[PDB]
Amino acid sequence: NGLTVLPPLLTDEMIAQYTSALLAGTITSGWTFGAGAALQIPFAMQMAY
Amino acid sequence: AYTNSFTRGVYYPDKVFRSSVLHSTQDLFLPFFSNVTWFH
Amino acid sequence: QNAQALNTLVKQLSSNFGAISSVLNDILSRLDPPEAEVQIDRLITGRL
Amino acid sequence: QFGRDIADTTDAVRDPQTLEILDITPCSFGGVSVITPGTNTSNEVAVL
Numbered sequence: 164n165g166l167t168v169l170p171p172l173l174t175d176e177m178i179a180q181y182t183s184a185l186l187a188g189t190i191t192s193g194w195t196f197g198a199g200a201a202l203q204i205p206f207a208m209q210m211a212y
Numbered sequence: 213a214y215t216n217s218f219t220r221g222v223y224y225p226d227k228v229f230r231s232s233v234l235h236s237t238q239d240l241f242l243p244f245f246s247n248v249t250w251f252h
Numbered sequence: 253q254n255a256q257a258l259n260t261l262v263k264q265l266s267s268n269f270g271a272i273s274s275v276l277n278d279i280l281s282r283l284d285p286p287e288a289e290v291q292i293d294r295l296i297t298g299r300l
Numbered sequence: 301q302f303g304r305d306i307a308d309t310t311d312a313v314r315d316p317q318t319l320e321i322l323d324i325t326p327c328s329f330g331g332v333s334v335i336t337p338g339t340n341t342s343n344e345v346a347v348l
């Protein structure tokens with residue numbers, strides 16, 4: 164009745180891709196993908212850090 | 213005699229259809245667990 | 253919270269706010285326009 | 301005779317001339333958003 168719900172700009176798929184990016188960086192590269200270009204590191208060694 | 217009218221005597225308060233929904237209404241109803249006059 | 257607020261905002265269309273109806277067509281047919289102005293003003297004020 | 305939604309607005313009717321069920325949907329409405337490049341670049345526009 165004159166009320167409307169507008170869509171989000173990002174779809175739930177895009178949020179699922181961004182959270183997968185955030186996660187894939189967090190897994191493969193430590194904090195480095197925040198601080199600069201993502202640098203790969205073995206996950207056991209990221210844990211030792 | 214007397215008898216307990218357990219959970220009974222509700223009826224469709226309007227000719228509306230409502231689907232799978234917990235509607236609420238004010239109307240003349242037999243009070244739940246009231247005390248009906250039983251005749252032999 | 254959002255569903256309750258939206259459903260409240262919708263239910264408030266049906267409230268009279270001291271007008272002779274909450275249905276705008278009733279006000280536009282149970283009165284002449286110069287009296288209906290007050291009834292619409294009450295509904296506008298309430299809805300607003 | 302007629303259906304209501306969760307907000308008790310009418311959602312369907314039975315046709316009294318022949319007893320099939322008509323679902324009632326609102327008449328369509330929405331914002332005319334205009335997409336534009338900068339006017340300091342073009343005068344072409346797109347309407348959403």
Ligand SMILES: *[C@@H]1O[C@H](CO)[C@@H](O[C@@H]2O[C@H](CO)[C@@H](O[C@@H]3O[C@H](CO)[C@@H](O)[C@H](O)[C@@H]3O)[C@H](O)[C@H]2NC(C)=O)[C@H](O)[C@H]1NC(C)=O
Pocket residue numbers: 317318
């Ligand atoms: C008010 O209701 C009556 C009863 O339905 C309408 O008359 C006709 O009644 C029959 C039996 O109920 C309907 O079924 C069949 O329809 C097919 C259509 O292809 C026809 O081949 C069959 O011989 C049989 O008639 C029929 O649909 C129904 N309607 C019509 C227009 O015939 C009556 O028409 C309604 N009142 C008014 C003022 O129209």
Ligand SMILES: *[C@@H]1O[C@H](CO)[C@@H](O)[C@H](O)[C@H]1NC(C)=O
Pocket residue numbers: 214215216245246247
């Ligand atoms: C119903 O009324 C009779 C007689 O007054 C009484 O014995 C009985 O306890 C009442 N039952 C209830 C449910 O109040």
Ligand SMILES: *[C@@H]1O[C@H](CO)[C@@H](O)[C@H](O)[C@H]1NC(C)=O
Pocket residue numbers: 340341
């Ligand atoms: C605005 O338009 C003028 C040409 O009409 C151009 O010189 C200027 O660089 C433009 N500025 C921007 C920010 O596009």
